[PDB]
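Predict the assembly for these two chains.
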Amino acid sequence: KRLQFNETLSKLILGGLRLRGISNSITDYQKLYKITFDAAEFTHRDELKRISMGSGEEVSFESLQETVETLLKLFTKSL
Amino acid sequence: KRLQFNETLSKLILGGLRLRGISNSITDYQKLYKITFDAAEFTHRDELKRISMGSGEEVSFESLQETVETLLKLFTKS
């Protein structure tokens, strides 16, 4: 779990939420962000572990973009 | 929730993991179960809340199964 992954994931979720007109001043925005973030980490857990093990890897932006879109699509259908 | 949602959700996760050949012996099995359980509850949060408040609704098997499948597909990519 490198910092670059963290920052890229955070940006993708912020952008995904904003793109959906979901404002950070609503009651479940924080819960929505957190579970998306945690789920996205868990999705890429194996590579994050390898990165931590010095594989010198980098989670690709494109794959993370798919993960976030899948999760936000799932988590915001009722919204 | 709606206790029936919770009981069915458990069965669908256990069943989805079984179909995929993922045994409870593997190292991340319980976290995999738990995060899928919670993400599925979250997905249907709004209806589940109305249900607990007496709306008379019921999350359909189809919808819940699609939820579980979306999550397990995403979470078991390895």
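The two ends of chain B are 31 Å apart (CA to CA). Chain B has one domain: 1-78.
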